[PDB]
Amino acid sequence: MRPEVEQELAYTLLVELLAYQFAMPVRWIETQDVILAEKRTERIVEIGPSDTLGGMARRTLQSKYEAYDAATSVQRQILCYCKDAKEIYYDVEP
């Protein structure tokens, strides 16, 4: 719980984490699952030029999460930057 310490730690952890990303497979599955299952987010937002991760997270909602969402009563809203532009910025007309 030393501030000076917590810094130098998260630092090299980060520095290493990025460094080795070259040579480690990208486990986007389990990453997606921490978002959908563990932190049960109602609002996945994507940021990029296309909805690539969006139709990707929609597909993980069909293959796995069909029953979980219907049971838990989890409301889910997947927003890409480009396509779902206005809903991000809370802009609607009267």
Partner: peptide
């Protein structure tokens, strides 16, 4: 009630 709802969702599908 919230738990029963979670059934209905599954049910209409």
């Amino acid at each position: 009630p919230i738990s029963l709802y979670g059934l209905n969702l599954r049910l209409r599908k």
